[PDB]
Design a protein around this nucleic acid. Structure first.
Length: 112
DNA sequence: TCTTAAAATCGAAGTTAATATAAACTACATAACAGACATAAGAACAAGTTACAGACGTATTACATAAGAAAAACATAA
C-alpha cells in the first residue's frame, strides 16, 4: 500500500490510511487521539498537503471542496476556522493564512 | 386780466438682435499658483459568533417467526 503519514508541529500525526489525527504523547506513540475529521476537513487537508510548500489560492481550494457549487467565501473562511479549531490550532501555526496569497499547512515530515 | 413759456400726449399687435477717434518709470505689498505632507474617509481580506437547516442516526412502538418448556394424551408393562 502507498501509505502516507504526515507529521505536524507539536508532534501532531495524521494517518491517511485510517484518516485519523492524534496527539503524540511520546515521539510517535498513539495514545491521545483527537479523532476523525469530516469529509471536507480531510479534503482541505489533502489540498494543502498536495500543494506543499506552495500556498494554495482560495479559488482552487473552493473548486476542490465544492466542484459544482456556487458557495460563498464565508463558507471557505468558516471551514478553515473549524478545521483549525478541531486541530486545536489557536495560535494559527498549523494552517497559516498566507497574506494575500491563500493558505499553507505546516508539515515537518512525510513517512511512507 | 392778458401774453408767454413750460408740460404732456400722440392705436394695437407683428417685427425688432451691437459697434468701431483720442506718458513713463520705480518701489512695494498682496494675491495666486504649484508642490508636498498628513489626515480623515474608504475599501478589501480575514476572523469570531450565533443560529438555522438537512439529512442522518437514535429511541419508541408494534410485531413474525422459530426455539424451548410445560402439559395433556396415549401406549405399554406389571
Amino acid at each position: 500500500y502507498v501509505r502516507v503519514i504526515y507529521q505536524f508541529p507539536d508532534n501532531l500525526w495524521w494517518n491517511e490510511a485510517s484518516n485519523q489525527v492524534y496527539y503524540a504523547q511520546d515521539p510517535m506513540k498513539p495514545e491521545r487521539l483527537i479523532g476523525t475529521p469530516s469529509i471536507m476537513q480531510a479534503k482541505l487537508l489533502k489540498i494543502l498537503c498536495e500543494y506543499h510548500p506552495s500556498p494554495c489560492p482560495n479559488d482552487q481550494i473552493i473548486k476542490a471542496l465544492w466542484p459544482h457549487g456556487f458557495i460563498s467565501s464565508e463558507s471557505l473562511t468558516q471551514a478553515i476556522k473549524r478545521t483549525r479549531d478541531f486541530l486545536n490550532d489557536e495560535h494559527k501555526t498549523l494552517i497559516e493564512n498566507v497574506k494575500l496569497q491563500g493558505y499553507r499547512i505546516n508539515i515537518i515530515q512525510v513517512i511512507v
